[PDB]
Structure 1
Amino acid sequence: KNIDGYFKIYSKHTPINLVRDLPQGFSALEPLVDLPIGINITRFQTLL
């Protein structure tokens, strides 16, 4: 998320058992790190 230039990543790593789709249940994403990037962003990718 990008608020006030700040780029914040919330995250949570969960041990699961699944092969497709997203599991049921509820888990809140704890804040992980906030980055004072201050720049605008509109697009992204992934790395594999």
Structure 2
Amino acid sequence: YFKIYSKHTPINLVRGLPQGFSALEPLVDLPIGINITRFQTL
């Protein structure tokens, strides 16, 4: 099972990660059943 959790946040900080807390809601659960060891950003 591939669990994808997501959270969308309105920010106005220029360069880095803002300091705070925001719990990520589950977005989708996919029954893909495949081996994953490497990933790529598009």
Give TM class, smaller chain.
0.7 to 0.9
Q: Unpaired runs of 5+ in structure 1?
A: 1-5
Superposed displacement of residue 27, structure 1: 0.2
Q: TM-score, normalised by structure 1?
A: 0.78
Alpha-carbon distance in structure 1 between the residues aligned to 2:32 and 2:13: 35
Stretches of structure 2 that go unaligned for 5 or more consecutive residues are none
- Relative contact order (C-alpha < 8 Å, sep 6+): which is higher? 2
Q: Which runs of 4+ in 1 moved over 6 A?
A: none
Aligned length: 42
Deviations 1:13-48 (A, max 9, x none): 0000112221011000000000101001011111x5
**Cα RMSD after superposing both structures:** 1.0
Identity %: 98
